[PDB]
Design a protein around this ligand. Structure first.
Ligand SMILES: [Mn+2]
Ligand SMILES: [Mn+2]
Ligand SMILES: [Mn+2]
Lengths: 156, 156, 156
């Protein structure tokens, strides 16, 4: 009954591990962002919110508002989901597409699913995650950063 | 019952203000395009049309056809919507994602919604709009241009 | 009842014609990829699979697994679709957006539709295809490669 679309990108820099779909992945560099740069969750939240017609992470997570300043993506997703259910919506299914030249996400997909299908209730079958390489082409191909696109569905 | 997806990008150049979602926004440069470069509406039209399985703005708005030569995006959207209803379709909901490093769209989102929810009938709640920065990464990050992605849904 | 999203890109190089949507298109260069670089079908398969929650072409088409090593995109799509129906899903509609500076896809859209609406059963009306230029902007604008995005829907 309601469709949503999210999109988000983040740039590299900072040694430490990166976090995607709530999973800590080892890698040369880390992701910037003044919040743990979880492009996957951020794009997922935006999809969900955009389908409920509630904004785009700037309603709960602005940037200069003491409401939700320092918090990880898992908390925001969880908060965003609460407001969405407040408007009487329930999850149908969500599909997430991660775009990066490296590192390899294939081995982490399942753990990501577990996290996501946990912070939204629902069973894993209602959550899909996949990654794509881009073939060393754009800013993602040159390893300058990482991007993610997501879609979602709601009800009754 | 029917899903659609649109995508569109435009390059900068030309002083004058830019137009996005039908709103006149102030900015250093303007958008090229041989039609007011309204990436937002163009991507929205394509979504709607692509869900109705009627093409991609080249059915009503080609480029070398005296049918709809000089016209703004609002007219084309409005025309495209008419043909869509002709095939007996009605709007479910649409979500638009604008991608740009600047200017800030946040303050114009609501006015955009008003315009869109006007040229498609329906109430604002069936139209969502959000913007994202890209973090100074791709051609959008370098300020070379602006892009937009959109999804939609129809019926009965 | 189930939404899906796909995305895929490929780089140029290799004289010979390119293949998109199963159609052989004439052009200066060809597409790399260690499989016929059919970005259109690959993105379409991923959408369908991602909506059925079955992966992302690495379940049927890995890279180092003698299962489905050398095969064109039409075979994989056809195989992927079979497994999808195995889980009791049926096609609702799909929309594909091809992104490239050249060559012109406009004249091939219909033949692509015929191929797609053949390997998925269903009538053409359940399959949409469109192309966009990008305005000589990103890696697609510089002619370095070609990309494709797709969405889909399933049932009962
Ligand atoms: Mn982010
Ligand atoms: Mn345009
Ligand atoms: Mn591919």
């Amino acid at each position: 009954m309601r469709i949503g679309h999210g999109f988000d990108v983040h740039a590299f820099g900072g040694e430490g591990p990166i976090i995607i779909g709530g999973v800590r992945i080892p890698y040369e560099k880390g992701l910037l962002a003044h919040s743990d740069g979880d492009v996957a969750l951020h794009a997922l939240t935006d999809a969900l919110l955009g389908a409920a017609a509630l904004g785009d992470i700037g309603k709960l997570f602005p940037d200069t508002d003491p409401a939700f300043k320092g918090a990880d993506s898992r908390e925001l997703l969880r908060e965003a989901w609460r407001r969405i259910q407040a408007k009487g919506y329930t999850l149908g299914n969500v599909d997430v597409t991660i775009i990066a030249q490296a590192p390899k996400m294939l081995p982490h997909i399942p753990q990501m699913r577990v996290f996501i299908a946990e912070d939204l209730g629902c069973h894993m079958d209602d959550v899909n995650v996949k990654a794509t390489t881009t073939e060393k082409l754009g800013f993602t191909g040159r390893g300058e950063g990482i991007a993610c696109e997501a879609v979602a569905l709601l009800i009754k």
